[PDB]
Design a binder for this molecule. Sequence first.
Ligand SMILES: *[C@H](CC(=O)O)[C@H](C)[C@@H](O)/C=C/C(=C\[C@H](C)C/C=C/C(C)=C/[C@@H](C)C(=O)[C@@H](C)[C@H](O)[C@@H](C)C/C(C)=C/C(=O)O)CC
Ligand SMILES: Nc1nc2c(ncn2[C@@H]2O[C@H](COP(=O)(O)OP(=O)(O)NP(=O)(O)O)[C@@H](O)[C@H]2O)c(=O)[nH]1
Ligand SMILES: [Cl-]
Ligand SMILES: [Cl-]
Ligand SMILES: [Cl-]
Ligand SMILES: [Cl-]
Ligand SMILES: [Mg+2]
Lengths: 121, 1017, 209
Amino acid sequence: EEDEEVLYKVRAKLFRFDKDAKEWKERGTGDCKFLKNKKTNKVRILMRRDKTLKICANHIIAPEYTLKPNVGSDRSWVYACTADIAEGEAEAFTFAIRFGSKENADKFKEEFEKAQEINKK
Amino acid sequence: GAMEGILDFSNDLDIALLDQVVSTFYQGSGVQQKQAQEILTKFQDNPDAWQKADQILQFSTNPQSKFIALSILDKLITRKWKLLPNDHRIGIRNFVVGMIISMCQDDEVFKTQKNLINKSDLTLVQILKQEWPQNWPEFIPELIGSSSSSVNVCENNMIVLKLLSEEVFDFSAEQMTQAKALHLKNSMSKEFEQIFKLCFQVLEQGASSSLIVATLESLLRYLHWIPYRYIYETNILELLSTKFMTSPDTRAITLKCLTEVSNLKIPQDNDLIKRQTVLFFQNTLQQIATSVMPVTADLKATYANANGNDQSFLQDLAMFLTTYLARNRALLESDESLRELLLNAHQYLIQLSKIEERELFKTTLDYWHNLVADLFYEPLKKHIYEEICSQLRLVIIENMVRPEEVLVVENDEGEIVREFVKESDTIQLYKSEREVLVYLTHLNVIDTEEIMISKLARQIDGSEWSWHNINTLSWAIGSISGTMSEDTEKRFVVTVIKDLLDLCVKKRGKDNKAVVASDIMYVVGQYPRFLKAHWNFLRTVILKLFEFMHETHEGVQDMACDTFIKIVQKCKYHFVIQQPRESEPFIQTIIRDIQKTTADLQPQQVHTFYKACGIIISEERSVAERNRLLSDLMQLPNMAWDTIVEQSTANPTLLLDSETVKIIANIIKTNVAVCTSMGADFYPQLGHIYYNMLQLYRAVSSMISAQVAAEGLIATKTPKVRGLRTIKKEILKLVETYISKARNLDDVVKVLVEPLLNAVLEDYMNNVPDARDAEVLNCMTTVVEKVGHMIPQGVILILQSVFECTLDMINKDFTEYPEHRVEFYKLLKVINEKSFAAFLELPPAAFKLFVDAICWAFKHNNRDVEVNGLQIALDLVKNIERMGNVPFANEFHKNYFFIFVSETFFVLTDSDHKSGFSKQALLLMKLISLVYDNKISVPLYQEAEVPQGTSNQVYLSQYLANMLSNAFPHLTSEQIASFLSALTKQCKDLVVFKGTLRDFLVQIKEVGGDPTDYLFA
Amino acid sequence: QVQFKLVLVGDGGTGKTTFVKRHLTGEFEKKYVATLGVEVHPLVFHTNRGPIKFNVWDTAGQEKFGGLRDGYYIQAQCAIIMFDVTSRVTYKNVPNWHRDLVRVCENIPIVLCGNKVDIKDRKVKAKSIVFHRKKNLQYYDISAKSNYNFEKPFLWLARKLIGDPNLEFVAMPALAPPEVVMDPALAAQYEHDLEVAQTTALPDEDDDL
Ligand SMILES: *[C@H](CC(=O)O)[C@H](C)[C@@H](O)/C=C/C(=C\[C@H](C)C/C=C/C(C)=C/[C@@H](C)C(=O)[C@@H](C)[C@H](O)[C@@H](C)C/C(C)=C/C(=O)O)CC
Ligand SMILES: Nc1nc2c(ncn2[C@@H]2O[C@H](COP(=O)(O)OP(=O)(O)NP(=O)(O)O)[C@@H](O)[C@H]2O)c(=O)[nH]1
Ligand SMILES: [Cl-]
Ligand SMILES: [Cl-]
Ligand SMILES: [Cl-]
Ligand SMILES: [Cl-]
Ligand SMILES: [Mg+2]
């Protein structure tokens, strides 16, 4: 993360959908950062768990992604990610990310979409 | 697969295969490891697997295989030993003894297979518990004799003896009957003279050895129970406190032994014995000082370095010094020649108290509490410790943990922010630290003030300035409130506040300002006596807190709200009166500007603010004036409410706005907050909103139902429906809160109850399970608790509406609808207490469900439910007994007496409800005593089942013997008869009755329990 | 590599498996499914002294599901003893677990953990928890649910095992993630998968995060 600019940082709880069960499972709580690589100009989400500092999200903010609401929340987004490497080899997930307030959630979407435009350049 | 071969007992056991399965489990990974685990458990659990143990021990090349063989034998010995033919018992004893001898006589095996030899030793001890001394009388003499033939065997014998002592004295209470425990304790006691002789000889003849260490480990266990003469009438104390403190390998265990020596029961008025107690302490401290470290050593640094066993040693030293001194420091306080020893031991404790290790600090702090609490009372003692206490003041003042009130903390990036969560695990630590510092302040108020005031001078002039240093000092200053006289305190507090304000002027930037603000808020909130005597100051503090309610720093803002209510809780009188030179009581000033003051607060903070105002208003005892203040306080929520009631009555659709739902919730929450502090005084405000609030409850209930109908059960998860249910929950909370505090119960019944029941009961009954609020049950519990005796028909209505439908939600498993489960049994409990007649009015089928529900509660492992179930059962039995010889009571006993007896026995004996033992025993004793005292007026048996004249006593014994015979078929008839005879005889003596139950619970876990155990007395 | 066998013991229902799962995946399992014998999971932490791997043997606390019992402890290099601060019997049993453990593992670092401190009605008072003192166990209040002190048992054990009192957890290096597109053929099933995810409510919507 030495070669990266922090465009945005927000406290968040990340979930992944377990389709075999039929439930959301927490993956981590901590600072979710949008990081722009200064050499390549590509923007990624990188999120680490509090205390252990383990990566729970590491993926490019792909222009193809779309943030959708969850039925139970006015302060969360759900989206399909096709290449997250937090746990090792690239893997597809359906993520949900929840924030401390609706205001933070709405700011995340705005920043997410700005980052998508950067990645289109 | 191939590994499963060992499970086929129709073929010879392939020991090589077993060793492979075992190796795969312990040393493998993933799927293969998991499969091997499953196979080994199945192998171990085969009731014939013990028959393979000998073969495994002889032919296996895997020590873990042999360990598992021994575990199989352990299970057999502990549960089925007396089921075996006698030759199998002899054979097993012989090959266990022989394996132990064989492994001890081979030096390489003795060195490298400690785990296996220890397991073998424990397995031997299990056999001793069954066989010794009655069928193994020479075990101890032969062990003692064998000790001289081999140093390995001697060492191993010390391990066997340690384990035997543990199993007999330390761990027998749960595992043996009272009678068997006494037998084994008496047996060990009778042969201990010869055991000690061996131990002492070994200790005399060696200095530092694995044999010496094992011997000392055994001694540690003996010290739990042996007579003090073995320690004081031999030379053993000299050896422990000199020789064995010098070598580090024996030092650790010797120190632990000396700690337990300090706990021996010892004659109180024997000068010789006192001299010996002083001498071993003197010797031990001399050895520490010469062989380990001098009194000046930096133990904080040593501990932090964490070399070898230093942390454990310093822990054990703290335990030794605190244990000994708490009991014996008086022995060292009067003789001038012992003063240096006394003060040196305490100086080591001072050094230990500087170590950074919270759990060790709690241990030393407990000691300091013991000391300072004694010095506070005992004439002529505090002067002895004046230098120790002065050092301790510095230690505590420098290591004060953050109080729960201080809501700011430094993050990893060096910024001062609001805490993420409460530091719950330092609550007790802070209280303990405060306790000690308060005593220390009392012991020398001049020293304490001088230390604090000079430390503050060093913060101001910058020499010692740091957040850490100003914080710990400020926390210390706040923590000693109450120690000084009002007059002395007045001067102290003035000096402190002037200096904190000076410090603030000098320190710039939001981080610095947040730290110093937090410290000033903490201190001022801790000195309400000062605030009460200084109105201009108090007024100015409050105005400053209002300024902080507009802080962008959320930690300072939140702390200002908490500090406001903390001050108001203690100083409220001064806000309600008109102070000299003020134009109005300050409560008027607060209320008039409440919109501006609270504009930047979050809703819950606004509610706290209103709650504080309520505290002040309840100081006004003139009713007209108090009601006027309440009306003034509630002006803004009432005006918002009035406009919403106008709109919502016009349009049920306008309530569908999420913004409006949030507004309503916050209005009701504001009412809850004020009602919480005003209680009975809140009634006029409740009356203003009551009828429209219940109409709103109905309207919101209709919206919730419509949404579930249109969208499915998933609607209950949506923000909109959760918001609507919040309105219902807060309305219920408001009514519960008021009724819980109401003083006019006639008005509660005549005005509040009928409309409440009308609004909430049918709605609860007629919603689907997932839309029912457990808060309804909670509200009804309080209604019944406070006015149940006045509303018999209302209580019947409550049961009709909530009983069967709630029971059906919670009677399919123990986990679904956890809040309903808990509130349901609280409700049944209070109805059974306050309005039992409601249960008498139930149709018989519903009364049967009530009994079913009670027994269902028994079977919960959740304590909130289980405890209430057992209490309802006991209360119900009492309620029935109070009715006397009447048809309802007679029918109750005929229908349900044996149901309660059998269900109580079931949870007593299933090993899954151990938490409820005491209350289960109480219930069973009540039931048995009903028959013992002939309080049941009709036969419990149907006629022709037994001869016509047969007593309920005879029938109860017959019923119970048959029940136990069928439920526990491995018990003998005499075990059952003897148990029941004792239990029934003991049904007026709870402690003895419980002992008999515990003995039964032991015997059911094994075969061949002695029926004479139930004669224990 | 640098890997240590850790055995986790304590009464049934105390939160042993939930605690491990939290560390393994980040999740909080609300259901109580009793462990059968033992479950073994590797668990890696990144430290300033390099990675440390714990092979966590999460044992069954229910007597009826105990399996090999003390057989699981053989060659353990460290341990956690768990109880539940809302259940007094679980603290009463701590000396029994400790006894069985140290008979097999005579000189290992052991942390005692009082779990479920998130629950309002605490029953084992802080002042009562003193068993660890004479046995030289570290002690922490923890909650697997709130994550209160959740990292502390592993940090302390790592420090003891590596022999470095200043060891700290450090941020694992974060490799640049790949650029990928969804393949068109899958897009139809992704629509279905996302609909199910969107219409399954997130748990604990009243929590701060
Ligand atoms: C930073 C200030 C800065 O930047 O300069 C800090 C964090 C402040 O913002 C916070 C201050 C707080 C409380 C103050 C203590 C409130 C001040 C009260 C005050 C000055 C009252 C006056 C009326 C006095 O009474 C003065 C004259 C008197 O000297 C006081 C200080 C001592 C008394 C009462 C002496 C006596 O004999 O009675 C945050 C809560
Ligand atoms: N409130 C709360 N619940 C917890 C916490 N930790 C675990 N639980 C809950 O406690 C229950 C039992 O947890 P589990 O991990 O299965 O316990 P265990 O000690 O592994 N049981 P066993 O020894 O039978 O395998 C689960 O319902 C789980 O959600 C906690 O910190 N707080
Ligand atoms: Cl072994
Ligand atoms: Cl003697
Ligand atoms: Cl007052
Ligand atoms: Cl018999
Ligand atoms: Mg488990």
